[PDB]
Symmetry: D2
Subunit: 253 residues, 4 copies
């Protein structure tokens, strides 16, 4: 505990990354809106992710809420999953502090090529999604903020779905999402994930979803959302379905 | 009717296409496994398309059979639709004679850049699919034969799904389809369709599906399947689900 | 003239663009590091284009300085062309005030999605390149600053080269440019240009060159360079060959 | 050295499966190009050393320099030294290997069609030897479907010589439209190293070699074969510059 986390994380990163290799990651982040931290590009120590995973498994058992809706601001794409709200996750001292770590944010800032600002709406700082059943999905969407760090805490086999599909270099018009038309005009990048992986996502300009589960499995992630200088902007849409299951943009079925 | 159809169709194409313009279409076919005949490049006269659509809506009314299964030889991807079998469609003199037309097959032979042989299995010569419910879909799959001309007879709005997604330059291993693995390695091309469109699909090397309907709509196609010189072989998989809903590879 | 330029350009752009259609251009700029303003998407009135072209054709005949060298900071890619220095172009009140026009910078900031800042080095605010001979080229390189609006004043036919090739989402390591290697890993996008076109380029993250002239033709551009907030840094490399032909990185 | 076919069969059998050849067949269709590097060897080192030693002898004897522009390919240059097919065919090693039913039988798993060694007696083989700056095999297609290129000696990538390719094209000798095709399509740059081999779909892939940025040494061997689509075809163009420097399409 204490400042030993940042001290060991800086060491963990200094053993693995250089400015030259981060710049290559920054190129891939700009090109794909997505950079994956796998066994080839570990981001945090095993002992640290295990601690975050055990914190999230306790939050799921205590505060999971089922969501089964369509979001009108993203072309009525579905949100079929369980969630844990940001206000409940922020109680975790481990998750809240590491999410504001200047060591972590300073490292990822070399990938984004701009400052990562931990000042987002109090209902969207953190998110856990927990999909368990067939057809569970985080439908096509964008984010209100620029940056999200996703912890692929548990992934089903790729044959069961659950991959992240992404279209970079897009934009979110809440009154006219044009999701299926964007797919017709653009190539979809499918990103397979494994348990233990993390990935950085440029959420405001990358249209993305999780491929629906073809079988009852378990797909669990943690979302750390941060702002860019561009997001310091007014929230609109009435579509905060995770914080409010009956938001104005949430539709039945 | 009759041979006046081949003569009229030959005139229809000579007004619109040249070998130079077909050659550019052939390039796109090899690159995408897919070429679309839309309002800017019609394939058949509107009178002829209306005659085929009226024929298919009749066969649907009389011989539709709901399918709701998963196909093991394509990674348990769903087949959630209603179909009309090839043997019932062949009874239509219009569709069967048009599917073996020396004018139509000869013209598309300049896009495929190889001979289009109408020597395919009697249960796969033709197929009509009729999706009408939310989540209805023709899951990811390949074709046993090389060529299929799909008539997009009725397409819902793009915002309701029903697009054709495709991954060209792949191959079908029925013992190990690797569908989701292929998607992770390849970019997906999504092709929107409108009612009246037609498209040619290289079905053996293009992994493809139809995007599931996001609500109750109607999506109706006619499939004309032909072979290349490479398909003149033996079928495998026990997965002919459209003809046999209880095929071995079909699951609930 | 003078203040009427902003009032005229504000009315010109207002009749040809919407926030929705500018957002689509921002996508293409993010995706390719490049967006072209051609006959489909004009940026300036024809009267304004002719005035700027006339100015440049004067500055050419008065300060054209031949450059034939290899720049070590970009893998010794050639620079075979004539140039006109920024300090010389700065004397033109038209080109200088246009580069700082709140209407011009304000509109393009919807494509870059970030503020465009006309605070760059005094030797790189403006540049005119004038390629005239076979094998003349502006070799593979990056820009020291983020943004550049290029005025394709006079382009040869595409059969004579002169197209802009680009690889977006890269970066400039002046100690290890890795140019040909990056080409082996990335798809090269070729952008053909016509006389009167303009294009906004993200020069810092887009590796780009002009295809060498296959024969003695005339290729003339005006380069307006601007900074993003990220550029407000130390110039490095001793490679300012356009202002100093005897630069350290320049192999004559 | 005898009947090589037993030795090559055991070599490939330990390094390939039908499932991994099919993945190469995917890449060959998608890119018109499949490279045999250290990751995927095609011939043993003892055979590569023999083929290389044979060619280096054919060079020192029958090297004619070509410095021309080919009209049927948009006047793209051909600055190199060559050795005609008739001179190369005198090598018992190259000719028997080029017709080996073990080599062809394996590569036909990548092409997915029969590879027929019935091609013109002046285009069976070709050795090109680029040694000076600007030396290049300019943008072009091939009259025949396939070519196995032996990258016997490749300079470092900083000196150029990489193969650039645009798959899913075709050769219109009356209207090549090379630079236009480049403006419409992405260029794939393939870096080669000494000892590499690659299979090229030469009729549908527009390809060239990047000019040597300086005096280096780029040596290749070309084994051109036909597909059934090339059988007994009528060669046209008057552009056989390799066999005939004064060909009708060859411009100085
Ligand atoms: N902005 C005008 C000068 C730029 Cl074009 C120089 C560039 N870095 C190069 O290497 O040619
Ligand atoms: N905007 C997203 C929710 C993200 C919540 C966490 N950043 C959606 O519509 O699904
Ligand atoms: N092979 C396809 C069926 C094609 C039937 C018409 N050619 C599938 O698995 O669904
Ligand atoms: N067609 C090629 C020559 C190939 C010779 C060997 N196959 C060219 O235009 O240069
Ligand atoms: O579950 C995932 O990987 C994606 C989540 C996402 O895009 C979001 O939280 O908005
Ligand atoms: Cl998001
Ligand atoms: Cl099919
Ligand atoms: Cl530049
Ligand atoms: Cl060739
Ligand atoms: Fe998201
Ligand atoms: Fe199909
Ligand atoms: Fe060639």
């Amino acid at each position: 505990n204490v400042e030993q986390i940042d001290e060991n994380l800086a060491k963990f990163l200094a053993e693995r990354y250089t400015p030259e290799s981060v710049a290559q990651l920054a190129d891939r982040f700009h090109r794909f809106g997505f950079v994956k931290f796998d066994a080839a590009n570990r981001l945090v120590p095993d002992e640290l992710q295990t601690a975050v995973r055990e914190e999230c498994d306790l939050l799921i058992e205590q505060h999971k809420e089922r969501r089964n809706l369509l979001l009108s601001t993203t072309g009525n794409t579905p949100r079929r999953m369980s969630v844990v709200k940001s206000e409940e996750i922020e109680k975790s001292e481990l998750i809240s502090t590491l999410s504001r770590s200047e060591v972590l944010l300073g490292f990822l800032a070399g990938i984004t090529r701009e400052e990562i600002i931990p000042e987002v709406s109090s209902d969207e700082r953190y998110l856990i999604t927990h999909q368990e059943f067939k057809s569970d999905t985080h439908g096509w969407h964008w984010g209100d903020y620029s940056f999200a760090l996703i912890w692929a805490l548990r992934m089903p086999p790729i044959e069961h779905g659950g991959m992240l599909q992404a279209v970079p270099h897009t934009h979110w018009d809440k009154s006219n999402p044009r999701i299926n038309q964007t797919l017709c005009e653009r190539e979809i990048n499918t990103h397979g994930l494994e348990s233990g992986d993390l990935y950085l996502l440029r959420t405001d300009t990358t249209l993305h979803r999780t491929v629906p589960l073809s079988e009852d499995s378990t797909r669990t992630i943690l979302n750390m959302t941060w702002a860019a200088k561009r997001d310091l902007k007014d929230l609109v849409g009435n579509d905060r379905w995770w914080e409010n299951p009956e938001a104005e943009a949430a539709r039945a079925v």
